[PDB]
């Protein structure tokens, strides 16, 4: 379902920020936005 | 009680300059020789069309004026107060005190019992008996105008007989209904006993006035076209002096 | 016939306080400054701030100088460079949808400048946040500062972030080394409500001209006068 992959994407975003990859976290943020704008 | 207006209450109707000419203008003017209410009391006086205010004082007892439709914080009102350094004019929501005033202690103003609310403050303006101060307050088309004049006087009481043009001092874009007003006096602390002073309030009425502008453009004399048949003749002839003869001024109808 | 036209008009709004403020708000908590009872020189918008980029959606900044308005609103916040394009009428995106939304019929000005030197920090500036989740799009000029946990699935979150239960704000974490697209931009939006907020030709003498003095339109020759006008 949509909820597992949402959670995995969210987790990557968080992990990237904790590991200092802020810029790549912003890019994953944009994907979350796009994904949830779908039905 | 009441006093005679004489020729006082004349102000420049507009910012137009006229020199050595007689101009007939219909506007809210204080009728000549009308009854002006005198006080030596700060009631909630009706503002009506406009208010002519004469202050005969040496101790600056008159410290300001409040103008409001309901005189409460429910609707915004316009208040002018004088601290000498900067007159404060505020079109804002204020909840006035039952007996608003500025309390002076021996002399320095120490108490400000005027309002408890300063909210929705739309407009704030800080600006700059041997002394007579005349002020015409008119609220028209949303603009409120104060016409002010200073006169050196030596009469003990009541309005001195004289002519003084009332120059427009300030005009502000207010835009709120003004139905009642109240002057604020400097009630000194003894229990409150105020110093000797007098203030006179007159209600302007729609009147036609013939004003004589001199070479300087100052109104040196005025004729109230409805005051008396001689004044009606002067207004009809558009001249301050009428020649010998018969003149038709108006029509009498029952 | 008149040789030329001369227009005469009389000879400050705290725009310095707005554009050169030390702190700016996060976009999700965008700041609104009401400006009123003042005169502003909108001609110099081109230089109200530095390295600016501006666009007006109503009339030119010059025409703003003629105009008057009851109130002016200044909205300000920080976002990413690549998100500045969303602060425009008719846009959709993470910012337009969940943070700050202009109406389709907006007629104001949008000004944005790169604030990398001020708002980025080594290690990350975590002050600046944006909303990433919301149950509906924002209406124009709506502001949402709630921080309720966003429940993405069917299980309750009982007020704590967890699986499919997301804190609704995210930090930009700005760092000096980000690309320009990801660097911080300070943004000011001016909207003009409708007049206590308001925005001259050389005088010629002894020449037949069509003159405009404070709305008095006339034709004639202007010469020196000995008339003592009263000040009013």
UniProtKB/Swiss-Prot annotation, chain B:
Here the disulfide bonds are 92-121, 225-235
Relate the outcome reported for changing residue 165 to V. In strain: 20A.EU1
What changing residue 109 to K does, per the record, is: In strain: Kappa/B.1.617.1
Renumbered to this chain, region (Putative superantigen) spans: 214-235
Instruction: List residues of the BetaCoV S1-NTD domain.
Output: 1-237
Consequence the record notes for mutating residue 158 to G:
In strain: Beta/B.1.351
> What result is annotated for mutating residue 41 to A?
In strain: Beta/B.1.351
Top-rank taxon of the source lineage equals Viruses
Task: Give glycosylation sites per the record.
Answer: 35, 83, 120, 177, 216
Summary of subunit composition and partner proteins: Binds to host ACE2. RBD also interacts with the N-linked glycan on 'Asn-90' of ACE2. Cleavage of S generates a polybasic C-terminal sequence on S1 that binds to host Neuropilin-1 (NRP1) and Neuropilin-2 (NRP2) receptors. Interacts with host integrin alpha-5/beta-1 (ITGA5:ITGB1) and with ACE2 in complex with integrin alpha-5/beta-1 (ITGA5:ITGB1). May interact via cytoplasmic c-terminus with M protein. May interact (via N-terminus) with host bilirubin and biliverdin, thereby preventing antibody binding to the SARS-CoV-2 spike NTD via an allosteric mechanism.
What is the name listed in the Swiss-Prot or TrEMBL entry for this protein? Spike protein S1
Organism encoding this protein: Severe acute respiratory syndrome coronavirus 2
Covered residues, full protein:
27 to 320 of 1273
